[PDB]
Amino acid sequence: KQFAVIGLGRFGLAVCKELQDSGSQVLAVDINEDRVKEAAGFVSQAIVANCTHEETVAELKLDDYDMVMIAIGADVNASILATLIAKEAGVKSVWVKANDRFQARVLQKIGADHIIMPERDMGIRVARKMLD
Amino acid sequence: KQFAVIGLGRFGLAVCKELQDSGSQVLAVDINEDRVKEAAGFVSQAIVANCTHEETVAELKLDDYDMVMIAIGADVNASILATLIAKEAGVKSVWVKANDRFQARVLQKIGADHIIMPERDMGIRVARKMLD
Amino acid sequence: KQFAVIGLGRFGLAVCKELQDSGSQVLAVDINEDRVKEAAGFVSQAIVANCTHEETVAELKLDDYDMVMIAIGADVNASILATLIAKEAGVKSVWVKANDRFQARVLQKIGADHIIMPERDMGIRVARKMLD
Amino acid sequence: KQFAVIGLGRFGLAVCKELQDSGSQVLAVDINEDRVKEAAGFVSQAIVANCTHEETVAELKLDDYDMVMIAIGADVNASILATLIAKEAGVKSVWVKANDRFQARVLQKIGADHIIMPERDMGIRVARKMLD
Amino acid sequence: KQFAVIGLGRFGLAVCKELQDSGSQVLAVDINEDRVKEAAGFVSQAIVANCTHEETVAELKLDDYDMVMIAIGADVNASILATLIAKEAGVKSVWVKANDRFQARVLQKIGADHIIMPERDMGIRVARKMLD
Amino acid sequence: KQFAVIGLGRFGLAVCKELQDSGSQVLAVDINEDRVKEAAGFVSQAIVANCTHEETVAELKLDDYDMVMIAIGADVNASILATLIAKEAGVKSVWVKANDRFQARVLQKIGADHIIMPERDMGIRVARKMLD
Amino acid sequence: KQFAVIGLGRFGLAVCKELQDSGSQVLAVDINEDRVKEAAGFVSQAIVANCTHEETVAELKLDDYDMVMIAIGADVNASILATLIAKEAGVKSVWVKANDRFQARVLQKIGADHIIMPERDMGIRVARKMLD
Amino acid sequence: KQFAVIGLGRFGLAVCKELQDSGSQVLAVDINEDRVKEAAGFVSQAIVANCTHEETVAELKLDDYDMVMIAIGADVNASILATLIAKEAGVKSVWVKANDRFQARVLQKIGADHIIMPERDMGIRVARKMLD
């Protein structure tokens, strides 16, 4: 029912649009104001915040949210650090998007429940669509 | 079924491994010999070639393969040129990977049959999967 | 007659100066403010705008102008993007300058009506000129 | 009608292909060997030579030719040197392609009979085509 | 007193040279063979290995060592990954060099017992030397 | 005591924060106005200036200050030039941060009084700390 | 007795300094105002002008000067065109500084009375100094 | 009667050519193999080596040669490093080419015996030549 999406890039905004279509509350948060405005018309609540800030994550009660998606791609260090802060925040289910195999290794060990690699994961499905 | 995959990045090598694991024969083509060596381990045939060159594409005999996947990610110019050359060669089905909506629309004008956006489509799937 | 010229390099400023000298109103658009200032002296209206931006083109109202000339030379990606946006904005006649035979074919697929190769066409013209 | 073309870029090859189609003797000279091979199919004679070399220009015997087209654009200094060698060699009429106004004015001062600026001239001609 | 140093950079060699002079056993590990040869004459044992490889760290038996110093600075992801693997290997105390404040924040959350920032730490020491 | 710190990166701002916390008045100079702003918060006086310029250094009156710390790290040329100009200005004591042994030798020849290699000196410090 | 120096770089400023110290009239001309101001203290008259402009060279009675030094190095076209304009203006002796051998060839063919190549000529001079 | 010239630009090859023409035996050293090849035609011995590397200079045995000329022009860092290494190797007389006065002063501090600034010194020489 209630979801949170951190990082509103091309991947993160795509999650927000589909989540809203199924009638679910989505908290879209992004450091960049422009990207938050784009998702403002597609989510229940759009907030400009830095999710690397520990106190900011405390205020945004992410432990209440059923699932939290971290969709930060360019800065590998932010996604790793935001994943950790969400874990101490009490988030039971943490989904993290990783662009590299080395990042996906770190995220697995630090405790991410689901690691998403869009290029590798889309590669497998597109092959399956080609086969059938 | 015989497939041709152009570009051997994260998406291209994932499609080849899935298409070769499913029992199909794949021709992996890339300009980087390092990635061609990686693909040559499991693909039926791997060739180091430039797929924006008309004579080179004629040499690869891409019209024989029923489906041609172009997975050139960073170089949008190379992706569009490869799609154009493959379509002119007489490839029945051309699948192209696109990073943005503008590249996807240009490829639609070029004549690409299926266009895959890894980030957006993976976001849609992640949203559906979180919705269970 | 009203003409819109996008890109104010050596070719674009020559078209504007020739078009305006004949009594036609020209709109000169470029991202480089120096060349927009240089054209503003003799051009009916000069605007500093990015014509690959689809919302910006709607503001320019390029659908009103009878012919739109896109004279972006160095940036081929910007050339195809501007042609695509102009066609999607409902421009009846789009003339595009192309620096290569591969760019010209992509522009033909996009929907450009007249494509000018400055080096090749001027070569043919001077070859005819020397003969006669 | 006997012609010589120096520099076999896009412009030079276009002058060679139009001149040969009209049915006149053309000498194509270019420092780069594969461009000479490309032009050899069309022109009567294609020679790989350096036209900034005084003795080479003397051996080419360019004073016989009715018109000499110097189509070197990338390096302005090579085009200037070759115009003077040609004019010292005794060529009656020398046509030179210039990419910049500074190059065009230098070539006018040194004695080029015809200076071709493909961007400006094609700009004027394209504007005239747009008018009618 | 038995020590291990991972990463034979300028910081790593300085630790290795000072440790051996006192009379304690030092294991020097670096992915690059050239740097391992440099410390081969300055440590008890110098091994070329990849310390982000989980099985390799097990073979090295780093849990026997009293202290391990991870001195990988150029690639932030390797230092984080090596720190986690060392902690999982059972090492009691792990000293990690961090070049950036963002890296040091992650390493503290990971569990590194001592984070060394050479620019910040030497900045304080140098100032105190200026005082007296 | 009056101190002058040139370059306000990690080392330079750490020396200034320590010097001012110890009750000393420090001058912070940097070409990056962004970093001069953080220093100006806690530094007695902060100036945006280029310290490789002789007239600029004469304007700063660095000869008044007891010690001049030059903490230009990435640009070794700027570090050498700043040390040379400071010595020619007439400053009694110059402390220079050097990231290379060769740079340290060149600075010794120039006339620097104390040269700090943060990586190597921090390595020695850390080794001594682990030993005891 | 009376000299003119065009271009006030490192070479031209040295020419002006030596010429004025010897006791002669020197008209120092440079398009850049900073260098003209720098040479204003030394030379009899320092003028900011573009010597590529033909009317400016006509206004500056360079034909009255015994010798004219053209010391433009970076832009070869500027030096060639300034030499041509000075020769057309009636200057009997024109000394031109050339940085490359192709530029020297062009200047020799144009008609410059003296071509100065500082690196080669000092190469010979310091070789002779080393020998004796 | 034995000289070593480091760097084989226009200045370095001119010193070599003159030194070998006067009967002396020159060792030409450069990192660019093309210039070492062109110098090897007339110099006594030519070596492709990096002269900023301490062990390489020891292999070259530069202490044997009475005079060592360092003609590295573009890379000021390489010029300073080569001068330092040659001086610490035990070369009695080191001549260095310097582009600017700041590099010249740094080289004076390093220990260079003769410093040649080609532009300024040719300015002085040409001024004296025009005077009488």
Ligand SMILES: Nc1ncnc2c1ncn2[C@@H]1O[C@H](COP(=O)(O)OP(=O)(O)O)[C@@H](O)[C@H]1O
């Ligand atoms: N600390 C952060 N807190 C919140 N959002 C962030 C943070 N760091 C990055 N983001 C956002 O995460 C998104 C991921 O985008 P990314 O793929 O990294 O770059 P790009 O937008 O260039 O493709 C961006 O919209 C970015 O603003």
Ligand SMILES: Nc1ncnc2c1ncn2[C@@H]1O[C@H](COP(=O)(O)OP(=O)(O)O)[C@@H](O)[C@H]1O
């Ligand atoms: N003209 C071309 N012909 C064939 N392959 C190409 C061409 N241009 C790029 N490629 C390949 O396409 C692949 C796509 O790589 P890229 O998307 O840049 O990296 P990644 O997939 O790791 O993000 C590259 O490995 C590159 O070698």
Ligand SMILES: Nc1ncnc2c1ncn2[C@@H]1O[C@H](COP(=O)(O)OP(=O)(O)O)[C@@H](O)[C@H]1O
């Ligand atoms: N996205 C864009 N929108 C509008 N104008 C552009 C865009 N990209 C490039 N231009 C303009 O097109 C002009 C022609 O480009 P170019 O061929 O590089 O210059 P020139 O024709 O003088 O060599 C440039 O002056 C540039 O400012």
Ligand SMILES: Nc1ncnc2c1ncn2[C@@H]1O[C@H](COP(=O)(O)OP(=O)(O)O)[C@@H](O)[C@H]1O
């Ligand atoms: N010294 C020379 N003698 C003869 N031909 C030359 C010389 N220098 C250059 N050329 C030729 O002139 C041509 C100029 O073409 P250019 O405008 O550079 O085409 P492009 O811009 O596509 O490289 C080149 O193909 C080159 O081979």
Ligand SMILES: Nc1ncnc2c1ncn2[C@@H]1O[C@H](COP(=O)(O)OP(=O)(O)O)[C@@H](O)[C@H]1O
């Ligand atoms: N996975 C790894 N396992 C072991 N050692 C590594 C690994 N990755 C990097 N290193 C080593 O860590 C050292 C850190 O060196 P660093 O000081 O960052 O290099 P630089 O001086 O070029 O910045 C490197 O010499 C490298 O060889």
Ligand SMILES: Nc1ncnc2c1ncn2[C@@H]1O[C@H](COP(=O)(O)OP(=O)(O)O)[C@@H](O)[C@H]1O
């Ligand atoms: N000429 C100069 N005068 C003053 N400050 C300079 C000059 N050149 C560089 N700096 C500054 O000196 C500092 C050197 O630190 P640097 O190593 O570049 O960054 P960091 O230590 O943060 O990694 C930077 O703040 C840089 O902008």
Ligand SMILES: Nc1ncnc2c1ncn2[C@@H]1O[C@H](COP(=O)(O)OP(=O)(O)O)[C@@H](O)[C@H]1O
């Ligand atoms: N058209 C011109 N008229 C007069 N002076 C010029 C002209 N073009 C360039 N100059 C001057 O000639 C000087 C020589 O330039 P250059 O050889 O590049 O010296 P530097 O490398 O120190 O800039 C430049 O400082 C420039 O100001």
Ligand SMILES: Nc1ncnc2c1ncn2[C@@H]1O[C@H](COP(=O)(O)OP(=O)(O)O)[C@@H](O)[C@H]1O
């Ligand atoms: N570390 C080095 N060791 C030896 N030779 C060098 C080194 N660095 C540069 N050189 C050489 O010094 C020569 C002079 O440099 P440069 O001034 O760029 O050439 P030019 O005199 O043609 O402008 C170059 O040809 C270069 O190959």
Ligand SMILES: [Mg+2]
């Ligand atoms: Mg994005």
Ligand SMILES: [Mg+2]
């Ligand atoms: Mg990819």
Ligand SMILES: [Mg+2]
């Ligand atoms: Mg143009």
Ligand SMILES: [Mg+2]
């Ligand atoms: Mg060409």
Ligand SMILES: [Mg+2]
């Ligand atoms: Mg290091």
Ligand SMILES: [Mg+2]
């Ligand atoms: Mg620093």
Ligand SMILES: [Mg+2]
């Ligand atoms: Mg200069």
Ligand SMILES: [Mg+2]
């Ligand atoms: Mg030189």
